[PDB]
Amino acid sequence: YVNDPSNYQLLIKNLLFSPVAFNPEQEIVYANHRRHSYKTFHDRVRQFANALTKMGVKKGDTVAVMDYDSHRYLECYFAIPMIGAKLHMINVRLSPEQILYTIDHAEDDIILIHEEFLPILDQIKGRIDTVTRYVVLRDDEECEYERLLEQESTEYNFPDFDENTVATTFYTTGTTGFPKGVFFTHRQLVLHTMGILSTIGTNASQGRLHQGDIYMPITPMFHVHAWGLPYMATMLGVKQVYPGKYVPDVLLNLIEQEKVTFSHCVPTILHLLLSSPKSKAMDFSGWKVVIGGAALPKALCKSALERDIDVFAGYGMSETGPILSIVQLTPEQLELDVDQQAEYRSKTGKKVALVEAYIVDEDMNKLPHDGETAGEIVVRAPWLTPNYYKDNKNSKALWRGGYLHTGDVAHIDDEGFIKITDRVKDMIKISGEWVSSLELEDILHQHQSVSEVAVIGMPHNKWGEVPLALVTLKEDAQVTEKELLGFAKDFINKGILAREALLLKVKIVDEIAKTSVGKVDKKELRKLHL
Amino acid sequence: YVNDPSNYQLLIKNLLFSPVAFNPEQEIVYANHRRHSYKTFHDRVRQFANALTKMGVKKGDTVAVMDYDSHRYLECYFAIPMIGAKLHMINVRLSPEQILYTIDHAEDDIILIHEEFLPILDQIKGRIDTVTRYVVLRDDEECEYERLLEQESTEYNFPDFDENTVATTFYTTGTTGFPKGVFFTHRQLVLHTMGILSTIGTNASQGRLHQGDIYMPITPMFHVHAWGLPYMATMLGVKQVYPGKYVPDVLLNLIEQEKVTFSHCVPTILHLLLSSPKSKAMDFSGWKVVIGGAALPKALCKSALERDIDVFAGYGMSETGPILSIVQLTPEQLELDVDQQAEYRSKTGKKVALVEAYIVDEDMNKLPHDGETAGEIVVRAPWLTPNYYKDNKNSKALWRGGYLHTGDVAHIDDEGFIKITDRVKDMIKISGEWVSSLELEDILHQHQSVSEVAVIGMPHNKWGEVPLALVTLKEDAQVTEKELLGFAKDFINKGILAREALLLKVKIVDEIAKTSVGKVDKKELRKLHL
């Protein structure tokens, strides 16, 4: 590759070696395990580059990583792409067969795997080909990664190449029969970091990330590049703390002792942290957790707001950067009380810089943003995956009509706020309208003797797909289906026949199938019940 | 596509419409079901082309087929490639998960499936994407294929395109963790037909296929294009009989009544046909079955020769055309008695026209053809798959050193005869030599109280991989491991320590794992026992 120095390429090496702020004394902390300055971080990155070069990794090669959140993952986030190789992030929460399929599909050359992830490999070891070396990662000095790093020198001349070379890749289950692989380039990652920093960094007084913060992820970090946060924090040169195993008590201790101010987690982890007895006497009025997993509930937002936590939501769908929208509060919205606060903070949010985000039905129409007309979200951003890896027809459906299809049905307010109502496949197509099953699930969950509710659709000649409810009862709770029918019929304000209460067809089931991540298997319930 | 008429392209349409001999009165017979002349066959091919065009199949599309041997499969062998689409042959003997993986990998658009293969689809129906239409095939008039054909006209202008467009594809399990997809072009198929017709058609008086024969396959016909035989017979314009379900009594009745003279099957089916009571009073002295499945045994060849059957072996490995070598007997070899006949007819054979077939060790050396020096077979033929579909590193190992690697270890006689001794992965690497486990399996199977034997290797510091035997005993047979050790030690004439009898390590196991095809799972036994 030959490049004229006038022509500038957006590379991750520019993100690391030309940050907004660089403090050599700033420290990266791995929880109760290790602590080293930014200068040591740069030296270790160069050592890792030398070690990867020594093992035969080249520009076209792929390196797979399988561990928790640590300094090693942060070093892999940089060193591998800067060599030019591909960083394959493996979802350790998938089934061993799916993990093996992803490894075979991506054709990884070297695998770095944590010690306590070894049994998962042990049952798919012989099935794996195309892999030459396994590096075992440990939390003590007997780590193979540490022994590999301590042999190399801290001197590397990082090459310059085209900004469109692929840097990272990972696989998402989605709704297809096999996991789909998404990929991004150096330019896309750099632009995502810059745009999100411009969006959330310029807010007046709420939900802003600045150079005085202390960062600590609470998301798995093999999903969606941990929302791009580790790239951003390194760009700001802020203190970074990595917890590892995600134990609520260790997390609370790290927040108290390291003075963490910025984080991102999911509603389940936030609820566990808030309900922990250790947290009842902990100061929380400096913390700005970002909830992005799925559908931050209003009650959880209220409970966090009563603890003086700047909690706000964001949207990302694992092939869109991921960040597309974040709730931002104008100064006259900060003076509202906790109910109006929790109303706004639980929304999907306004689109971030350089995002279009139209609402569109089938045949691509541009339904207005009145605030109640729902439709599928289609976006155009500088950091979208062009297609699926080694796929043709799903790639065509992904970019149908010239826009990326999110698969989420939402309505957009006149002021720009987005409120996601359901998923495209989960919409019940009664007659000629489209009701969202989420509000029926919420209504049925309001019952005192109901634990979990799943709503699906079953064919019906005159009224299309009609709804069906599977409910799980509580301890020593036995309410007949007629009682639940009356409970749902009690509510008002909905369309269709009367209030669409003649076809609820609620049934009581002991258990509801869930994915390996922990999400209801609506497809399967469809297979089981129809 | 624009072509100068002077420039000639080798296409399957030339194979069908410009045969060696064309008799409109010659008939194709589907067993006790249907019987129609060659003119009707051409009309049905044109009707199928029109029907496929009507459903939206185009040049780049793929059509999958799942049924037994019938006129419909013969029509699919032609019509789909002549449109320019890809014919994906699905192995119905694989597990449903493997079948689903192959369907997802090949991205089939339309699936033609037999009725009694429906349950297999029923458990993978929802997992399947990228498929638009399913056509159910039946043996009566309610077949969807027949109803689709009877609407179209018998008039089609078949296009002309580049001879390098892919025509057929199918998947082989091999030794990898996932099935590997191989593909061939129109030119390769035409050249394979022409070369094999030139090779076996020009023999003096034994094992020759000519225009007066009657053809009937006994191989699954989704493997290896049924050895290319259906293409060849259609080229010769000979009578063709398709049995379907492969029931030994129906097969014998078809051979008796249709006067079948040429066939290809596997040793198991041949043994079942020979041992059937119905066959004890059947005339067999016009039949020229070709055995190509795997390792035709000498005893079976003798038993068939005592029934006046011209039985001979052929070699094909599912990515080599498949035909690479066929045994051909010189006129002074026909005067030998049954023992010398069965010696020669059970060999791998001499290479067919336009085949190189060298013997080669690691680092690619060209060990001489002395008759006892074993090595891996590497070939160069006009009908080899260039690589594996959507694969990189296995493709590199397939064509390592500039030759296609068969994976079979054999020795070549000075006269050109090849004798396959084992598989590359199944070789036991004791010390510095390579013993073949097949002869030890044969020796141990010679015991009176032994049913089946599997030989594997287990590590040993001073002598590399050493052999281990897993044996299954007969009804009320109990012989200790020491007795089998002495039985193996009784024989002579082998190298290594004494006769390599200090490490046999024979063990008795109730059952031995087998593939879905019925072959021992040596990899698994390795996983289970070590």
Next chain:
Amino acid sequence: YVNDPSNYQLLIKNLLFSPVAFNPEQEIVYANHRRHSYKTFHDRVRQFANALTKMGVKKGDTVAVMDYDSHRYLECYFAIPMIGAKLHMINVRLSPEQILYTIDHAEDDIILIHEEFLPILDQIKGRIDTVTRYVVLRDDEECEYERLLEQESTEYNFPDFDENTVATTFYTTGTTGFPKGVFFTHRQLVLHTMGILSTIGTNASQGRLHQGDIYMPITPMFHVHAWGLPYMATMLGVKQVYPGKYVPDVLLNLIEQEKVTFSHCVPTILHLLLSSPKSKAMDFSGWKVVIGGAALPKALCKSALERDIDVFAGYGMSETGPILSIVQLTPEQLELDVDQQAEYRSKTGKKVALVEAYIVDEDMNKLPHDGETAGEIVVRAPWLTPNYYKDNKNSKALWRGGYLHTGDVAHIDDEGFIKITDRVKDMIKISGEWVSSLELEDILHQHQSVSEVAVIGMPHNKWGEVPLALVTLKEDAQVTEKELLGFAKDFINKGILAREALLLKVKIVDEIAKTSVGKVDKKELRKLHL
């Protein structure tokens, strides 16, 4: 040239070193002169390659050959093309001026010429340029070719190149004012060999070439690559005998002593062999001569059939491979008596594999194959010359309408049999119909006092071109033109005015002009008489 080993090229070296059968003990025999095994043949081919390399012959060079049928011509058929050079076959039966024109047009670099062809060169020696070396060939040890071969080693690495490189070329007089040069590639020759072997090798019991035959050409072998037979026999590894001078007694002795079973000759040579006194006590019931020169007569076929000779006809026109059609007899046609045998064996035949062979008038229409509608034969085959060398407008007329024009007018039966009736230029265009002069020549030759007859056309205002007969009388035979007119008028069953007997215009001429090959100079008779 760089080639990926996966990409296979069809080369003559593959035809020689990868045959159907290779027997090192099989011998090539030059009549009463030399006899050497196939291993010696391969060694001599390598030696000739080394010798040609030593003289400066390169890929683009051309080597001309001028001799009879011998081992040297067979070695030139292989060695020259395998180097990549062009083999120019010179017709030694042409006039010295035509030979000189062909040499100048083809620009030969080295000329190999037999001793007794030296006088022909002596009168055109000074006129020749662009030629650097002359190699004199002799039948004794003083041959320059033998002395050149005995210096080189038997070791050559034959290169691999594109399959579309030109291999052979030769010149045909045709109907143009100067000889026209045709050329073929390696791929075309290999495909011709494979296709004809597939066509004639797969016949049931008549007219088949197999690996147990003994081959001996009786055609000049500088015409039409000797019908491709020497390439085919070498591919089958059969014994080959080369007679040389074509003396009938030497030919009969070779057939008797070498046990020749397959041959190809012309009707004149066959008649000379059958009428020889030596042949009256010779066994002929193993011989399968192929007649392909021109228009095998029915009487000669009957006479050969009474001698128990499997005599059959073939069609080739010197720019079509040459083989296009061969008569093949179905098993129920072998049971007919000698008259019906001679009827079928004298026909042009059915088209061989991969040949289209439509019948077409001017403006390219596709007149039906009823069996009596005549038209010009146009073909599409994998082994047709794209054009004439260094020619433009004749090349356009050769491939007019997208098909190669044979120049022969024939009718095709409903069963596929072709019967050539005349040449396009020799058709008499009376009024609005086209009569063939061949049947009038046959009718007039039936007279008892007639030796030879030539029919031409002369203008006539109201009836287009009308026929004219030039006849030669026998010894002391004097029949007036009126007697011949009445003799022709006696016959019946023809169209046009009455029986087209009012314009015969028969004339008696002492001699009729003939080409240097021995064919009537109809153009010249047109020039002389009109």
